[PDB]
Design an enzyme around this catalytic site. Structure first.
Site, PDB file in Angstrom:
ATOM      1  N   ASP A   1      55.296   0.964  94.321  1.00 44.27           N
ATOM      2  CA  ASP A   1      54.639   0.607  95.585  1.00 44.27           C
ATOM      3  C   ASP A   1      54.728   1.795  96.539  1.00 44.27           C
ATOM      4  OD1 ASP A   1      53.623  -0.520  98.044  1.00 44.27           O
ATOM      5  OD2 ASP A   1      55.553  -1.747  98.183  1.00 44.27           O
TER       6      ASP A   1
ATOM      7  N   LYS B   1      47.430  -1.346  97.898  1.00 47.03           N
ATOM      8  CA  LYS B   1      47.276  -1.668  99.263  1.00 47.03           C
ATOM      9  C   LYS B   1      46.253  -0.714  99.833  1.00 47.03           C
ATOM     10  CE  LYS B   1      51.972  -3.129  99.760  1.00 47.03           C
ATOM     11  NZ  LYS B   1      53.362  -2.624  99.889  1.00 47.03           N
TER      12      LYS B   1
ATOM     13  N   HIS C   1      48.934  -7.776  99.703  1.00 49.55           N
ATOM     14  CA  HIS C   1      48.921  -7.949 101.178  1.00 49.55           C
ATOM     15  C   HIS C   1      49.898  -6.935 101.792  1.00 49.55           C
ATOM     16  CE1 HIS C   1      52.677  -9.911 100.260  1.00 49.55           C
ATOM     17  NE2 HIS C   1      52.563 -11.006 101.003  1.00 49.55           N
TER      18      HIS C   1
ATOM     19  N   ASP D   1      60.617  -7.740  94.416  1.00 49.76           N
ATOM     20  CA  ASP D   1      60.329  -6.478  94.981  1.00 49.76           C
ATOM     21  C   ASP D   1      61.578  -6.084  95.726  1.00 49.76           C
ATOM     22  OD1 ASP D   1      59.595  -4.201  96.564  1.00 49.76           O
ATOM     23  OD2 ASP D   1      58.148  -5.277  97.673  1.00 49.76           O
TER      24      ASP D   1
ATOM     25  N   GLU E   1      56.551 -13.422 105.572  1.00 51.63           N
ATOM     26  CA  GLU E   1      55.583 -13.712 104.500  1.00 51.63           C
ATOM     27  C   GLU E   1      55.627 -15.157 104.073  1.00 51.63           C
ATOM     28  OE1 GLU E   1      55.796 -10.711 101.312  1.00 51.63           O
ATOM     29  OE2 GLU E   1      55.038  -9.166 102.690  1.00 51.63           O
TER      30      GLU E   1
ATOM     31  N   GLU F   1      61.993  -9.234  98.328  1.00 52.86           N
ATOM     32  CA  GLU F   1      61.127 -10.390  97.871  1.00 52.86           C
ATOM     33  C   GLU F   1      61.591 -10.994  96.601  1.00 52.86           C
ATOM     34  OE1 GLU F   1      57.047  -9.066  97.851  1.00 52.86           O
ATOM     35  OE2 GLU F   1      57.390  -7.767  99.742  1.00 52.86           O
TER      36      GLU F   1
ATOM     37  N   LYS G   1      49.582 -10.132  94.868  1.00 50.64           N
ATOM     38  CA  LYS G   1      50.796 -10.389  95.649  1.00 50.64           C
ATOM     39  C   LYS G   1      50.369 -10.654  97.093  1.00 50.64           C
ATOM     40  CE  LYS G   1      53.941  -7.524  97.149  1.00 50.64           C
ATOM     41  NZ  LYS G   1      55.143  -6.611  97.314  1.00 50.64           N
TER      42      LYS G   1
ATOM     43  N   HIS H   1      61.690  -8.062 106.102  1.00 48.87           N
ATOM     44  CA  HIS H   1      60.802  -9.153 106.387  1.00 48.87           C
ATOM     45  C   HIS H   1      61.483 -10.365 107.046  1.00 48.87           C
ATOM     46  CE1 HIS H   1      57.803  -7.650 103.102  1.00 48.87           C
ATOM     47  NE2 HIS H   1      57.967  -6.778 104.092  1.00 48.87           N
TER      48      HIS H   1
ATOM     49  N   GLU I   1      59.463  -4.466  91.308  1.00 51.81           N
ATOM     50  CA  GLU I   1      58.740  -3.470  92.066  1.00 51.81           C
ATOM     51  C   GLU I   1      59.687  -2.659  92.856  1.00 51.81           C
ATOM     52  OE1 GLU I   1      55.802  -5.403  94.685  1.00 51.81           O
ATOM     53  OE2 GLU I   1      56.254  -3.765  96.306  1.00 51.81           O
TER      54      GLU I   1
ATOM     55  N   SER J   1      57.903  -2.372 105.903  1.00 51.86           N
ATOM     56  CA  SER J   1      58.559  -1.401 104.921  1.00 51.86           C
ATOM     57  C   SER J   1      57.521  -0.411 104.408  1.00 51.86           C
ATOM     58  CB  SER J   1      59.352  -2.181 103.821  1.00 51.86           C
ATOM     59  OG  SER J   1      58.487  -3.081 103.095  1.00 51.86           O
TER      60      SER J   1
END
Ligand SMILES: O=C(O)[C@@H](CO)OP(=O)(O)O
Ligand SMILES: O=C(O)[C@@H](CO)OP(=O)(O)O
Ligand SMILES: [Mg+2]
Ligand SMILES: [Mg+2]
Ligand SMILES: [Mg+2]
Ligand SMILES: [Mg+2]
Lengths: 439, 438
Positions: free
Chosen positions: A324, A349, A377, A253, A216, A175, A400, A166, A297, A49
């Site tokens: 993000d 990130k 991550h 998230d 994840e 998430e 995270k 994911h 997020e 993403s």
């Protein structure tokens, strides 16, 4: 009278190679070698993403290797022009190293060499220079960061139900996370997280739901609604002997850019139920009354600055609101957000921006504006644990880095246990007080 | 005249800690520190389908921590008695180091300290010694193995559909694997495994099947029978532009102990269909005529020595037959197997026995008898990539280390990439000829 080998910190060789990430796709690794014998090595992670303003991940597009996802051009940049430009430069001058790369590339988004090329060298250089200085990477990072000897252990947010891009399930919210705020050490946090994750498997099994895992490490069941993720988590937390709110809080998230279609937020898993930004903010708000969700997020699309302003005005006093794909670890964009009252937190990130120097600049800007920084991550990881040292060395306060399964996530937890064991009370675990809106 | 720091290989400190494995369970890591400043570090893997004769994985059973799976007792053995017995010993003498540990523990199955403690130290010591000797772990391993300067790159068998105790699905057979025998390098093999693995997701998504992954990084769909796994793999191989047989061959690991119940093999995902040893062997044969399956591990129960004798007589001239829980990386048990015409291959798991020294002895015993040795992971792994260097340093020829997803598996492939880049043609990739019966 004698010059130690530590003083011999000029770069003598840089080796780039193609390795494989935790999804099986190629990525860039680099090794940086110094005159005194020191070496550091690192790898670029890779998102699924990805925000449209991320610095460029350069892939080869040759359908005959790895279905077009080769990184031979990026590695060639590392081995050819990057190397040629850094040979003879002092690795201890991080900002100087990064600048030569960023300048040589000459592009806004790092599209000549790739952000993947430049990042791998940038991080490997830091490791090298740490060792030339006789110290662990978190210590060198605090020095680079302008905050020498100041550390903390981050409060982790652990994504134990995976969805969106994911996972292969009917969950739109990318998430669903737990945070072990009631822990006194990150070692305790890690154990609490493991316990809850294991009790969640038992919960899901008793309901006939799948316990295989997404990218994840969290479970990827099909659920009757995105909210149901929260109910099963609550169940698991209680089954593990823990108090929701007191011992464990929640975070999400949404990665809502991934479900914004024709100006509305569309929950495909919930029969294509459509929302305007205000209505979606109200949906989120109702969740925050029913469960102790203390962080959200990317609650809206990357491009919906109007919606973010609104969300921040309604929820931001109470809830941490993490940008993000909104910010892409990018000072230019975060600054404008801070000026417009947008978000109160940023997800950091290093590969959204492409160098350790630019990443430390984004952490400084957030801290200076009272925003929290959450070190992250990517969904595509490697066995590399750099982000653990980054979190401690910048005292960011939060990390995270995944569910409590897959070594692509658990290697960062293990690095946290190692760092905390060496530092003890020099790196406090501050608990819920690190999260925006709880201090 | 001047003594270098590499000569100061005496142990000065040993540290144990509890870290976390790829399933989120505790395991033991140890660091071994030498006088000259050299450090090695390593961790114990952990199985789920564990043989009843494996050396003991010591856990705490304290239900208030990690559901009882704590490894504090093992870590205490590392930090107290083990450390205190090895401090002052030369790390380069692997055999002596492992002897002191084995002897102090003094039980058959390492049930006092645990094999998890002893192994973590054993591997961390080897790492330290390599560093003291100025060399990569694969090179020190070859010298420890009595085969200096002699290397190969192993042919990987890649478990891309997961079942049994590795996954929450209706699949009885534990692993279905591809082997990229047509590759000229381990780097090309890894690419071909990635490509097939990604084409497999597409085939399963076209069929409405789940592409979440099991413990070893392979897909964990529900299937209409065990053999369906081979059909979807074959579809994937063709969709990837590869030729099944010539480019890619298949391998299985039945872990048949896990479905052996009141003396019969019971396929629970196929309506509790029961088989004697002989009729389970015939089931397997039938699969070997339909697909180019060239290796089958743990085709029968660890206790069914009679049945393995049969299966080896019947299938062993043409197929590799790997004992795993059958042998538990244990020379006492492999010796009796070789004497009784049982299997023709062994799966080597350093944690089944608990030291690098005993593991090298199992590898030797196998090669001396013309059995192949397949270096293996466990289903609970860490970022540790020791088994890559072990496979190369013992020129074992094959490796079993996972699907092409999860860094718990991919860390080992990455380390094989790095090794091959350094060795080039000093570590040949021998392909199909490494497999017993080829
Ligand atoms: O969206 C995100 O925050 C990340 C990390 O979980 O996922 P990706 O790397 O897929 O962007
Ligand atoms: O049975 C096996 O061969 C292994 C490796 O796949 O699994 P476990 O470690 O669970 O024994
Ligand atoms: Mg994303
Ligand atoms: Mg997001
Ligand atoms: Mg097993
Ligand atoms: Mg088995």
């Amino acid at each position: 009278q004698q010059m130690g080998r530590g003083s011999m910190s000029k770069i003598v060789k840089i080796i780039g190679r193609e390795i494989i990430d935790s999804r099986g796709n190629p990525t860039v690794e680099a090794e940086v070698h110094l005159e005194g014998g020191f070496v550091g090595m690192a790898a670029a992670p890779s998102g699924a993403s990805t925000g449209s303003r991320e610095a460029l991940e350069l892939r080869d597009g040759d359908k005959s290797r790895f279905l077009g996802k080769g990184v031979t051009k990026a590695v060639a940049a590392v081995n050819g022009p990057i190397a040629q430009a850094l040979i003879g430069k002092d690795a201890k001058d991080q900002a100087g190293i990064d600048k030569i790369m960023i300048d040589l590339d000459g592009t806004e988004n790092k599209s000549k060499f790739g952000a993947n090329a430049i990042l791998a060298v940038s991080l490997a250089n830091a490791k090298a220079a740490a060792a030339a200085k006789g110290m662990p990477l978190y210590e060198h990072i605090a020095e680079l960061n302008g905050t020498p000897g100041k550390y903390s252990m981050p409060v982790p947010m652990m994504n134990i139900i995976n969805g969106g891009e994911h996972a292969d399930n009917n969950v739109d919210i990318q998430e669903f996370m737990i945070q072990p705020v009631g822990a006194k050490t990150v070692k305790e946090a890690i154990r609490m997280g493991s316990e809850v994750f294991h009790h969640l498997a038992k919960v899901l099994k008793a309901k006939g739901m799948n316990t295989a895992v997404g990218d994840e490490g969290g479970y990827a069941p099909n659920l009757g609604s995105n909210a149901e993720a929260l109910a099963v988590i609550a169940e698991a937390v209680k089954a593990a002997g823990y108090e929701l709110g007191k011992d464990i809080t929640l975070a999400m998230d949404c990665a809502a850019s991934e479900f914004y279609k024709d100006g509305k937020y569309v929950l495909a898993g919930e029969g294509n139920k459509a929302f305007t930004s205000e209505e979606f903010t109200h949906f989120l708000e109702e969740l925050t009354k029913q469960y102790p969700i203390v962080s959200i997020e990317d609650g809206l699309d990357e491009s919906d600055w109007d919606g973010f302003a609104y969300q921040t005005k309604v929820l931001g006093d109470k809830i941490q609101l993490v940008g993000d794909d909104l910010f892409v670890t990018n000072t230019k964009i975060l600054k404008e957000g801070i000026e417009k009252g947008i978000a109160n937190s940023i997800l950091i990130k290093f590969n959204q921006i492409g160098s350790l120097t630019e990443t430390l600049a984004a952490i400084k800007m957030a801290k200076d504006a009272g925003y929290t920084a959450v070190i992250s991550h990517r969904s595509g990881e490697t066995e590399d644990a750099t982000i653990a040292d980054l979190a401690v060395g910048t005292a960011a306060g939060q990390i995270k880095t995944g569910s409590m399964s897959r070594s692509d996530r658990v290697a960062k937890y293990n690095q946290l246990i190692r760092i905390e064991e060496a530092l003890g009370e020099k790196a406090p675990y501050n608990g819920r007080k690190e999260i925006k809106g709880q201090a």
